[PDB]
Amino acid sequence: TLRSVCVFCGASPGASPVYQEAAVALGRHLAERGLTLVYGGGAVGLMGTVADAALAAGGEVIGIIPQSLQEAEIGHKGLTRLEVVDGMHARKARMAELADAFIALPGGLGTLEELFEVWTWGQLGYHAKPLGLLEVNGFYDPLLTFLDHLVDERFVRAEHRGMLQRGASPEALLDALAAWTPSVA
Amino acid sequence: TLRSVCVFCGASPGASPVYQEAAVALGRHLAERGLTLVYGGGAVGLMGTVADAALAAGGEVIGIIPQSLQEAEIGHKGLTRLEVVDGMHARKARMAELADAFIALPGGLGTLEELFEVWTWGQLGYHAKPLGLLEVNGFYDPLLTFLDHLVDERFVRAEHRGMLQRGASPEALLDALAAWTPSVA
Numbered sequence: 001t002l003r004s005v006c007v008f009c010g011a012s013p014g015a016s017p018v019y020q021e022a023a024v025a026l027g028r029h030l031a032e033r034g035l036t037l038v039y040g041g042g043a044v045g046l047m048g049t050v051a052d053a054a055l056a057a058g059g060e061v062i063g064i065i066p067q068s069l070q071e072a073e074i075g076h077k078g079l080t081r082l083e084v085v086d087g088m089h090a091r092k093a094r095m096a097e098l099a100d101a102f103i104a105l106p107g108g109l110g111t112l113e114e115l116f117e118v119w120t121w122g123q124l125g126y127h128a129k130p131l132g133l134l135e136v137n138g139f140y141d142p143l144l145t146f147l148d149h150l151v152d153e154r155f156v157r158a159e160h161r162g163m164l165q166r167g168a169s170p171e172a173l174l175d176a177l178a179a180w181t182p183s184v185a
Numbered sequence: 186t187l188r189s190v191c192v193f194c195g196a197s198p199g200a201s202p203v204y205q206e207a208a209v210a211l212g213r214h215l216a217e218r219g220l221t222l223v224y225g226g227g228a229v230g231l232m233g234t235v236a237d238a239a240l241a242a243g244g245e246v247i248g249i250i251p252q253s254l255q256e257a258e259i260g261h262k263g264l265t266r267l268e269v270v271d272g273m274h275a276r277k278a279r280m281a282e283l284a285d286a287f288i289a290l291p292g293g294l295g296t297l298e299e300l301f302e303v304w305t306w307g308q309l310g311y312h313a314k315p316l317g318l319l320e321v322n323g324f325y326d327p328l329l330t331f332l333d334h335l336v337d338e339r340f341v342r343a344e345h346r347g348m349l350q351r352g353a354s355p356e357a358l359l360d361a362l363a364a365w366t367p368s369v370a
Binding site: 010012013014015016019089106107108109110111112113116117119120123139140142143145146149150152153154155156160 | 195197198199200201204274291292293294295296297298301302304305308324325327328330331334335337338339340341345
């Protein structure tokens with residue numbers, strides 16, 4: 001049973017409307033499902049979009065932001081709660097602490113470092129929470145090819161590769177996350 | 186002027202001899218160049234290989250390991266120094282502190298989370314040190330395709346994308362890192 005899902009996503013909006021459309025769909029779906037959205041607390045780019053969509057649908061949203069980005073004034077003013085913490089490391093740990101699962105929408109370097117870090121925490125046995133990519137057109141295609149090469153070349157175990165789900169539909173991806181177990185090897 | 190280079194690389198050896206051959210070449214080259222090798226301090230997989238090759242060539246090697254991995258007994262016993270620190274976050278920060286540049290050899294999830302984190306630190310203006318991928322056959326090919334998609338889709342700025350160099354030759358990659366400046370946009 002999922003109750004809260006942490007979403008990682010770009011601080012930019014992306015070069016085309018498809019990214020914002022996916023963000024909207026994800027945000028709306030989480031709220032419709034009774035799930036709490038946990039995220040980095042921004043009002044810019046896809047961060048803004050996913051939070052606004054969840055809020056507009058009546059969902060609870062918890063933003064977790066380091067003081068450094070907060071005084072850079074990027075912080076959302078309409079959330080259920082906006083938690084200001086001491087540093088990026090504390091931020092990521094808090095986000096993970098409150099989440100039952102993790103979803104990456106498209107984003108850049110920060111989105112990817114968040115995802116790979118939480119994934120590594122799973123690999124190392126710090127949590128057993130599933131992760132997933134919300135696919136938007138072919139955005140994640142080459143990353144997926146790369147990630148499967150890691151398994152073929154034996155730098156990543158099949159069971160750790162299997163912590164990462166994927167789907168183009170928020171409903172189908174959330175279903176996969178909610179049901180995820182190491183038993184389906 | 187580079188004096189120390191931090192290398193990120195797999196804790197596994199990889200499915201074929203090409204990975205270890207590259208690691209050996211990199212390690213040897215750093216030492217031949219008078220550069221200090223900074224790394225995660227392991228004796229397993231490509232970590233072991235790069236360190237051994239640098240040591241065999243007479244180079245200085247500094248390993249930085251969290252107490253948690255140290256008491257999991259993966260720590261190299263023949264380095265110039267092996268620094269045991271408090272946590273993964275401290276580890277990464279120390280590694281960055283001692284490094285003038287960063288190189289990723291092939292690896293898995295941990296290698297990638299290290300790389301993307303240090304890259305993000307650069308993007309955010311915490312350091313202005315270059316990063317590079319040591320290419321081994323077509324290993325990094327799909328990652329590179331993905332990374333260029335991030336720029337096309339405007340989730341990553343061209344100037345931040347340009348902090349990451351690449352090369353199949355340790356000599357040519359180190360040359361690119363040593364010379365790197367934001368001016369070559």
